[PDB]
């Protein structure tokens, strides 16, 4: 009567109508919890999570009726293929409840967790925003070290047992779905099958990540050494000129970004401050201004305005001392033309650039809204983040900041402002790549069982010391779970997407600037006022997940894989200048020097000039060509 393909057309349309209705309802519940944090809202959100995940279980079960080798229409085959993924539903009704409770317990421990002043128990501080305020703004080695150690021993130790159990359950789920381990499950996002030359295997991702990281390593070495010399200028007795930077002195709670170090590391501080935060406050910008300015940036390249619904419904500021919100910058695609942004916007260049990033997410969503339900997604986990990042790449240029009146009309480009800008960008962009690779490799190793539990923290800090050049200021036994002190770890997010994104973006920025007819180095490119580049971008955005990320990338940039070439070209002037800066310093780091076990009061030495003569000779031979 009806062939499998006609049956499948019918099934997919039923699935799409119901899934759209249900997804919109569930997303409204999620919006309620994230703007209004109340138990009534948690209850509704959890109820909708049940309805939704159970719905997808049923539809995944139903989708197995239709074999993929009996399907001609490709748009049908892709949808069915997505639907035929079992997910985490494979576990028993008992173990699924246990793992869900673990995930919730860890997330609550993170968000509710507070450390109190030892001398004042009644006054406590949460991570957001109390402890972040310190890790961003403090200059006190002891206050910063208190906050860092406090967070890792008060909330991290609570998380250790839960994370052990969580790893066991996640690996059970991954092997039950015929992956080697939960890390392999995550690497499945980058998988491609059946597209002939555009295929991509899960183990291939680790090889490409590490191979690309190699070429990041020299630039990172030099940036790290310059940052070390500059952090010595501010923490005189606490940093050795040949050692990893102490973890608590890095700009946020983890050293995930070195962005807030810029005020200390600024090369040429006499020249006007390319960080327009100060300018943003002398011009009394509120959040509405920041987002309207971003909107203008997108219209300039031929993209659409934000919907009436966006301005009506978005929560663009922290909603007051009464009602608490989840202040994590997020872009919401709910279906039915409904697009929102949740960001507790502060008047800082960080939130200016974020606003551009998160509005870029909204552009990607609005572009692919016409695709079928399951294909209303990015080509992989890194694509959305790359889309966001390129917008900030244009927004952050001094050219652009000038054209929007954040830098004065009499602002001249020069060698020094160029070096200032590249250093700042590298603090945000290059500083996070070793962090991200190290964290994800640790996780991957844990899930594969290469790291036993007696050596979780031992190996975590071995790898911080080795890959990142960051050393803990306080020894950490296995009662610690330092990795879970970060949200992305204890809330079960993959993290390699930030590394892959970081390469993609420059690959993208290259291709777009060609489309914009940019003559000049890639780091002076601003795609504003170029519909030609906006068109080239939109062509890829409206695709969504309709075709695999190898092809989605190649369509825009000309390559089927991650490339580190553009990234090095972006930072080349800074690479040269940093190498010159470090010419008489040391480069690299010792894994062994530590704040707690590296100090030595040099009362008496043994040799005439100590080893300094030998050290000079050995470094000459060491870096010899």
């Amino acid at each position: 009567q009806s062939t499998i393909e006609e049956q499948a057309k019918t099934f997919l349309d039923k699935f799409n109508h119901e899934a759209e209705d249900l997804f919109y309802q569930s997303s409204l519940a999620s919006w309620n919890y994230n703007t209004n944090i109340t138990e009534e809202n948690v209850q509704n959100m959890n109820n909708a999570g049940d309805k939704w995940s159970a719905f997808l279980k049923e539809q995944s079960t139903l989708a197995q009726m239709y074999p993929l080798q009996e399907i001609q229409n490709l748009t049908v085959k892709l949808q069915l293929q997505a639907l035929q993924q079992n997910g985490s539903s494979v576990l028993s009704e008992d173990k699924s409840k246990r793992l869900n409770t673990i995930l919730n317990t860890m997330s609550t421990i993170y968000s509710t967790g507070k450390v109190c002043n030892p001398d004042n128990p009644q006054e406590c501080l949460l991570l957001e925003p109390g402890l972040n305020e310190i890790m961003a703004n403090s200059l006190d080695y002891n206050e910063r070290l208190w906050a860092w150690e406090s967070w890792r021993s008060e909330v991290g130790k609570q998380l250790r047992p839960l994370y052990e159990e969580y790893v066991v359950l996640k690996n059970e789920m991954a092997r039950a779905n015929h992956y080697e381990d939960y890390g392999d499950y995550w690497r499945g996002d980058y998988e491609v099958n059946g597209v002939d030359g555009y295929d991509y295997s899960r183990g291939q991702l680790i090889e490409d990540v590490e191979h690309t990281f190699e070429e990041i390593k020299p630039l990172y070495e030099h940036l790290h050494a310059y940052v070390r010399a500059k952090l010595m200028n501010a923490y005189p007795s606490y940093i050795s000129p040949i050692g990893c930077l102490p973890a608590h002195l890095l700009g946020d709670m983890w050293g995930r970004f070195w962005t807030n170090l810029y005020s200390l590391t600024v090369p040429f501080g006499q020249k006007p401050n390319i960080d327009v935060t100060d300018a943003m406050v002398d011009q009394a910008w509120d959040a509405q201004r920041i987002f309207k300015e971003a909107e203008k940036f997108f219209v300039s390249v031929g993209l659409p305005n934000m919907t009436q619904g966006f301005w009506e419904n978005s929560m663009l500021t922290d909603p007051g001392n009464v009602q608490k919100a989840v202040c994590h910058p997020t872009a919401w695609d709910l279906g039915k033309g409904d697009f929102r942004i949740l960001m507790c916007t502060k008047v800082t260049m960080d939130d200016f650039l974020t606003a551009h990033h998160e509005m870029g997410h909204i552009q990607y969503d609005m572009a692919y809204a016409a695709q079928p339900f399951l294909l209303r997604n990015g080509a992989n986990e890194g694509f959305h983040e790359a889309v966001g990042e390129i917008m900030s790449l244009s927004a952050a240029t001094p050219k652009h900041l000038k054209s929007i009146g954040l830098l004065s009309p009499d602002f001249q480009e020069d060698n020094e402002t160029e070096i200032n800008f590249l250093l700042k960008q590298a603090l945000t962009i290059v500083g996070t790549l070793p962090f991200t690779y190290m964290l994800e490799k640790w996780r991957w190793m844990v899930f594969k069982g290469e790291i036993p539990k007696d050596q979780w923290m031992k190996k975590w800090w071995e790898m911080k010391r080795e890959i990142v050049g960051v050393v803990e200021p306080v020894p950490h036994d296995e009662t610690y779970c330092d990795p879970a002190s970060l949200f992305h770890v204890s809330n079960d997010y993959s993290f390699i997407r930030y590394y892959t994104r970081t390469l993609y973006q420059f690959q993208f920025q290259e291709a777009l600037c060609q489309a914009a007819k940019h003559e000049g180095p890639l780091h002076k490119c601003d795609i504003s006022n170029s519909t030609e580049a906006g068109q080239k971008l939109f062509n890829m955005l409206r695709l969504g997940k309709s075709e695999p990320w190898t092809l989605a990338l190649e369509n825009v940039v000309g390559a089927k894989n991650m490339n580190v070439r553009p990234l090095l070209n972006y930072f080349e002037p800074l690479f040269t200048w940093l190498k010159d800066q470090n010419k008489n310093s040391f480069v690299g780091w010792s894994t062994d020097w530590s704040p707690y076990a590296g100090s030595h009061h040099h009362h008496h030495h043994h040799h005439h000039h100590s080893g300094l003569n030998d050290i000079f000779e050995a470094q000459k031979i060491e870096w010899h060509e």
Binding site: S27, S53, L56, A82, G87, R376, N377
Partner: peptide
């Protein structure tokens, strides 16, 4: 965070 994904329908806020 509800998503249009089968493998990962729900993500922790």
């Amino acid at each position: 965070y509800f998503q249009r994904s089968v493998r990962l329908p729900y993500l922790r806020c």
